Amino acid sequence: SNPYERGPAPTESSVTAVRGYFDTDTDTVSSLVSGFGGGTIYYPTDTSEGTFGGVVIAPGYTASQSSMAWMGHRIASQGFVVFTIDTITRYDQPDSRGRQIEAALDYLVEDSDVADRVDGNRLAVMGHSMGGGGTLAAAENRPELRAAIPLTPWHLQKNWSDVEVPTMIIGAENDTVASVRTHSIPFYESLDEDLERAYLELDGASHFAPNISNTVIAKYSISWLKRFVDEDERYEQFLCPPPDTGLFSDFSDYRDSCPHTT
């Protein structure tokens, strides 16, 4: 059986809930850490079912932890150790954000007081905007990563055909900052035809959708992490078959590689 399965059999309820099964706590990481600006670790207090996958989440240009904080307890409560990092400076570029995510993954797995609850073999990267660009850069440098979720990603590099990490790109229909025509769709279309991947385009959404509690983003993020970080087939349910994308659907567009096999 899957040794990495955590939590009860999921429902539409459970995956869209503001808090899942697991009681969660936080540890704060100082800006004194090398390689990034610190952050907050959100982690399940219940260790009886075994260790959890670790997930670093990077902010965008001018922003910090607080723009992504809502994902902390909401993802962690599903059975993840979730690291909402700050960057060294608010003006750090995507490649720099990418390096800061890698440092944060290493800090989480090697140095954090919760490292004993993280399975260092099962790690994921997420990030908003330039942090999304950062997420691709990390995914590209670290093919051992189980899952990558760029959110309204921004990057001057368009070609990511080398990424070996299951990639869910969530775009915003009406994004004028990281336009899906010039960022998300070029990035998605460049992925290996053999790679496990999704493109979610949120209907009439703006660049800031990822910084506001969003049930679509959370459901599909948790499903993607469960499927690839935990190899949890029980979440294939939520990803495959793909959802409808007519005009009062959550999605102006949805691209998929169903079924997933891990």
From TrEMBL:
Looking at its record, which EC class is this enzyme? hydrolase
Q: What is its EC number?
A: 3.1.1.101, 3.1.1.74
Q: Name one GO cellular component term.
A: periplasmic space
Localization per record: Periplasm; Secreted
> Which residues are noted in the entry as Ca(2+)-binding?
196, 257, 259
Disulfide bond entries: 240-258
- Stretches assigned to the PET hydrolase/cutinase-like domain: 1-259
Top-rank taxon of the source lineage equals: Bacteria
Q: Which UniProt keywords apply?
A: Calcium, Disulfide bond, Hydrolase, Metal-binding, Periplasm, Secreted, Serine esterase
Q: Spell out the reaction equation it catalyses.
A: a butanoate ester + H2O = an aliphatic alcohol + butanoate + H(+); (ethylene terephthalate)(n) + H2O = (ethylene terephthalate)(n-1) + 4-[(2-hydroxyethoxy)carbonyl]benzoate + H(+); cutin + H2O = cutin monomers
Q: Which GO terms describe its molecular function?
A: cutinase activity; metal ion binding
Per the similarity annotation, which family is this?
Answer: Belongs to the AB hydrolase superfamily.
Record-given protein name: Poly(ethylene terephthalate) hydrolase
Q: Which organism is it from?
A: Marinactinospora thermotolerans DSM 45154
Coverage span on the entire protein: 50 to 311 of 311
